[PDB]
């Protein structure tokens, strides 16, 4: 139950000595294990006698055997080279708006100058995530007030119908059991208002 990014997001030489840049994300064990064609391209371009570090584990090149090993987190930023991908993909899906009813925002994410991400939860189960930024994206100007609303919705637990645009898709959440998307609107749940 892990979302797997496509190859096209595998941007060129990015993170150096472990500093994943402020526009990209590091991969982990599950994303590589669950993907096949990326391993093909990797073993077709990466030479031997090199040890790379994942977010959690580590990777060994051809001479060692090209193997994934488990390790406590933070042990993969020792080495120079880093496999990191761009955390945005223009999906090309139409601009229809999708809504989800009776969900609560939790698990705030914020990194570097990246987006502010909160995952919505219904009946104990994670439903969908939403992010918005004031630096990039079509909903750049959306941000200035959304946070405020989101803020109280984070502080309280009032049920909300959340709107989402699927034109663009994110991967800021590692080991995510959902597909994070963009944020386009929040509506409070009044049970009598035929909304929730």
């Amino acid at each position: 139950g892990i979302v797997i990014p496509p190859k096209a997001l595998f941007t060129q030489q990015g993170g150096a000595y472990g500093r994943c840049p402020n526009g990209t994300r590091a991969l982990t064990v599950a994303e590589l294990r669950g993907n096949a064609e990326l391993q093909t391209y990797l073993r077709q371009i990466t030479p031997g006698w090199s040890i790379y570090g994942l977010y959690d584990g580590t990777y060994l090149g051809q001479a060692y055997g090209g193997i994934i090993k488990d390790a406590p987190p933070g042990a993969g930023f020792i080495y120079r080279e880093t496999f990191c991908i761009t955390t945005i993909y223009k999906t090309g899906q139409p601009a229809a708006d999708h809504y989800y009813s009776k969900v609560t925002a939790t698990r705030l994410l914020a990194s570097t100058n990246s987006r502010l991400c909160a995952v919505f939860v219904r009946d104990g189960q994670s439903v969908i995530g939403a992010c918005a930024s004031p630096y990039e994206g079509r909903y750049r100007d959306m941000y200035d007030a959304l946070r405020r609303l989101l803020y109280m919705i984070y502080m309280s637990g009032l049920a909300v119908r959340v709107h989402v645009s699927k034109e663009e898709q994110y991967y800021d959440y590692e080991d995510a059991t959902f597909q994070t998307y963009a944020l386009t609107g929040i509506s409070l749940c009044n049970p009598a208002a035929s909304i929730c």
Partner: T-cell receptor
Amino acid sequence: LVQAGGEVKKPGTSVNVSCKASVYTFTNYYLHWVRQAPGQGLEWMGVMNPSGGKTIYAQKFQGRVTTTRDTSTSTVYMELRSLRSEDTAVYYCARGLYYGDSSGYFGAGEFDHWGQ
Amino acid sequence: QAVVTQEPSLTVSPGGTVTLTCGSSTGAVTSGHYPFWLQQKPGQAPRTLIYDTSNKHSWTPARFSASLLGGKAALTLSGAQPEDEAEYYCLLSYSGARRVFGGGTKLT
């Protein structure tokens, strides 16, 4: 979803098939009725909305089936009337979507839980 | 209502790629038809491998893919295994909250 077993029947009668679900599934989720013939492909029959009360039928079963939203047993009853030789098949109750949500959803969606 | 056309059966060896096509009788398949690609195995109830256009589920295999090509829905399977060959069905949404199922396609 615990569906009681069917039986071979003679023409000129009615068949009452029960779609037993959980309490949450009963009150919220849409429920679809589909027919599976032995060796042939399935044919979608209809959908039910527990709260709106209007169940949309396909014309091939329009006027030939009824549905009721029972609330004691928590089942959903589908009645087939005027049985003809062509209706020999298994019938499946599938789940659709939450009442107030669009389709797209990673963890669950249309046709994720099926009856026996 | 309408009937979706599919080939009776297709063949592919393990490790190969096979495209299953479902086409609309009325005309070209539009994205508003909301295709659903479902997989049915003997002794099991069918499940939705692909919904909408190309979106997936948690249990959806990463080998499959779907798209709308040539005015018809095409599901591409890359590198088949013996444990995935089964019946594959195409579902199309239509005006009036209609859903049209498919004759199917035996996979080999």
